[PDB]
Write an enzyme that holds these catalytic residues in place. Structure first.
Site, PDB file in Angstrom:
ATOM      1  CB  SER A  99      -0.911   0.015   1.217  1.00 49.82           C
ATOM      2  OG  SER A  99      -1.971   0.924   0.983  1.00 49.82           O
ATOM      3  CG  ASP A 106      -5.510  -4.701  -3.117  1.00 48.93           C
ATOM      4  OD1 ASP A 106      -4.377  -5.190  -3.301  1.00 48.93           O
ATOM      5  OD2 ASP A 106      -5.767  -3.823  -2.257  1.00 48.93           O
ATOM      6  CG  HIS A 149      -4.566  -3.610   0.699  1.00 50.28           C
ATOM      7  ND1 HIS A 149      -4.132  -2.975  -0.444  1.00 50.28           N
ATOM      8  CD2 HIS A 149      -3.810  -3.120   1.712  1.00 50.28           C
ATOM      9  CE1 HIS A 149      -3.156  -2.139  -0.141  1.00 50.28           C
ATOM     10  NE2 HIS A 149      -2.940  -2.209   1.161  1.00 50.28           N
TER      11      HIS A 149
END
Length: 290
Positions: free
Chosen positions: A102, A241, A268
């Protein structure tokens, strides 16, 4: 057991966890997401030590155990330097593998843009090259969500009230669909989400929750620059995700020769939804680019 420490890195004391491999063959450095979480939710990557891959974990400035620097330093540019200073202060001039999740991904990308000559390979999991895009895509996800939880997000969200139960129920649903597709969340993950809720980095650099990036990075976007990354790149992303695979495509499109793997049935936090699959992919990629 990993070698933990609290040494000084580029000004402020930073905590890091170096798990050496019995027969080290490559050293991989990690960058947790957030901004403002911790390395904790990435511990599952330790499994790679049984593959001759030493994994270095650490809490970015103002995160987890590390101390918080001056707010003027709450930027990716600073994060990069911290990453660099840490790589040298520990490994020196040795070339290593960089990975990020991320925010750690977007961060990792920035690092590659200026310090790719210090890396043998780059790994980006559910990362991004443009926060705006991530926002446009994240808004689409909320709309697709069942009207019920969707309405709550837009209602209380605009009224700036994330304490309401109806809002949280929606936040919980969304998370359980695009953040981590499982009940019984692993402690390491809950530990990280707790660190970001105690410190300040998350409130300043990011914002309230996941799908509410209204901090000091909401306009970040190095898409027209990542094209400069030449080192081998493994771009991963979950099917559900929160940072849609479409965003992963934009990053994949520029970086030539880069790989793009989309984990089916995963969100994710794929390193936990498919710990074995994730660990195997990264271990293979790395070992094939020693």
């Amino acid at each position: 057991e990993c070698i933990e420490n609290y040494a000084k890195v580029n000004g402020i004391y930073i905590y890091y966890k170096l798990c050496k491999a019995p027969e080290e063959k490559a050293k991989l450095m990690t960058m947790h997401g957030g901004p403002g979480m911790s390395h904790d939710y990435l511990l599952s990557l330790r499994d790679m030590t049984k593959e001759g891959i030493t994994v270095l974990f650490y809490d970015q400035f103002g995160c987890g155990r590390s101390e918080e620097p001056d707010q003027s330093k709450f930027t990716i540019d600073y994060g990069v330097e911290e990453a660099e200073a840490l790589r040298s202060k520990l490994f020196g001039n040795e070339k290593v593998f960089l990975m990020g999740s991320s925010y750690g991904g977007a961060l990792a990308l920035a690092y590659a843009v200026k310090y790719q000559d210090h890396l043998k390979g780059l790994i980006v999991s559910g990362g991004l090259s443009s926060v705006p895009l991530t926002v446009k895509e994240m808004n689409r996800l909320i709309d697709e969500l069942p009207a019920k939880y969707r309405d709550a997000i837009k209602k209380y969200g605009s009224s700036g009230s994330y304490e309401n139960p109806e809002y949280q129920e929606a936040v919980n649903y969304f998370y359980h669909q695009h953040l981590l597709r499982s009940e019984d969340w692993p402690p390491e993950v809950l530990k990280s989400l707790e660190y970001a809720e105690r410190r300040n980095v998350y409130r300043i650099m990011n914002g309230p929750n996941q799908f509410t990036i209204t901090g000091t990075i909401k306009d970040w976007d190095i898409t027209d620059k990542i094209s400069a990354i030449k080192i081998p790149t493994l771009i991963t992303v979950g099917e559900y995700d929160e940072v849609t695979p479409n965003v992963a495509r934009v990053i994949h499109e520029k970086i030539a020769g880069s790989e793009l793997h989309v984990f089916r049935d995963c969100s994710h936090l794929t390193m936990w939804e498919d710990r074995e699959g994730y660990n195997k992919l990264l271990s293979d990629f790395i070992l094939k680019h020693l």
